[PDB]
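For reproducibility, we list the full input for the bromide ion complex.
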Amino acid sequence: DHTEITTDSLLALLGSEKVKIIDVRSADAYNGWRMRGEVRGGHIKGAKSLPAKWLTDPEWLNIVRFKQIRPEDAIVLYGYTPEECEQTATRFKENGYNNVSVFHRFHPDWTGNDAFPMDRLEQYNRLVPAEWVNGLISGEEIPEYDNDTFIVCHAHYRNRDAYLSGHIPGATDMDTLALESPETWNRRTPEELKKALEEHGITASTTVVLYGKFMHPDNADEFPGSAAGHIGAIRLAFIMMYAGVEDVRVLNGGYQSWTDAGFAISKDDVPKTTVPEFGAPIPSRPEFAVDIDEAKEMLQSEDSDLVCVRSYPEYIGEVSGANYIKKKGRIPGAIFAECGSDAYHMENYRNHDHTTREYHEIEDIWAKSGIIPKKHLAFYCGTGWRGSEAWFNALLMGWPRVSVYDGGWFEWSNDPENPYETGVPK
Ligand SMILES: *SS[C@H]1NC=C(C[C@@H](C(=O)O)[N+](C)(C)C)N1
Ligand SMILES: [Br-]
Ligand SMILES: [Cl-]
Ligand SMILES: [Mg+2]
Ligand SMILES: [Zn+2]
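The corresponding predicted structure, in tokenized form, follows.
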């Protein structure tokens, strides 16, 4: 039996540092998706995201603490209904949080009056929920979509089994080698790009929906990237967006999210349906891609920064980060934005279910090191995969000048003329 907080008391508490307001709905609803047909979607201004879905995760309590939600705080929970909050509030009280309220009236009361402040992930419609994808493939009517032509694409890196072992019904598979070169690990040339997309059945006016499957990347193995399918997907989204595919979506949390929602999976080897003309000059969005000359410019410019999205061991030069990279070190002058544990994991940018981490946290961490939207930013990692994921996050926030420096450490370290640092920073 939980305390209730009224609409009015809550409104008067929105600036209080001791109150933590916690949205227990899915991360996609938090982000903006109007999952119940609500007119204004997103979250109560200043609310944190803690999906009720995550209650079955053993590390639940560490997530909460890592979100800086403390027993001294006044916790106010809300969902689509008060009932979805029941289990969360119990769980809080069971772990020593004695000040816990539930707000009953988020929808329709808070959402359906414009005096009540809400916030949302500005380009949330590019980061789609499973149910939207289901709607799309089922012929159903769905929000944030006014197109007649789509294609669901399962990304992988030389591992068709990641697709054949189970995929979204009707999706075709795209190897990441179709759009990037194994020589440079950079995007392919315009001509190749054109030909590969045509042959994958994609025009500039097609709504492409990208996802991949997480298969527990193991650093020991020859091709750990073959198991990091949803990073690969976001990488391909980058390239398609650069190319000039106007509407690219990424399924949030990958294949995982589709199955977690209990939707059916296929094992067919779906053949491609080619199209003859992409229908647009490639690349339409060249500003998304930055190359080494420009990268160098950006390093000696107040207006701009390179953002290093690698692991800490890579950063200090303990490991190269991959088995085809010989040199260990970092690019001098970049801003570190620690990806996670190694080159095939993105823990700092993701939740345990692989969905994007609460965007406010990404924002504030980035802000603490001067990664801010008024700069031209180029995100990079070893070859551009984690760079892409970081870039995509910034993009989702509406950041006006974000890029991927494609070459990354692999390109930079391949010229022995290029300077580099190593060891613990100074
Ligand atoms: S951004 S460093 C690394 N993270 C995952 C990749 C992809 C890479 C790999 O599988 O190691 N390939 C596909 C070889 C570019 N980059
Ligand atoms: Br992944
Ligand atoms: Cl680096
Ligand atoms: Mg590259
Ligand atoms: Zn917000």
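Residues 212, 214, 228-231 surround bromide ion (ligand 2) (CB under 6 Å). The two ends are 54 Å apart (CA to CA). Both points were considered when choosing residues for closer inspection.
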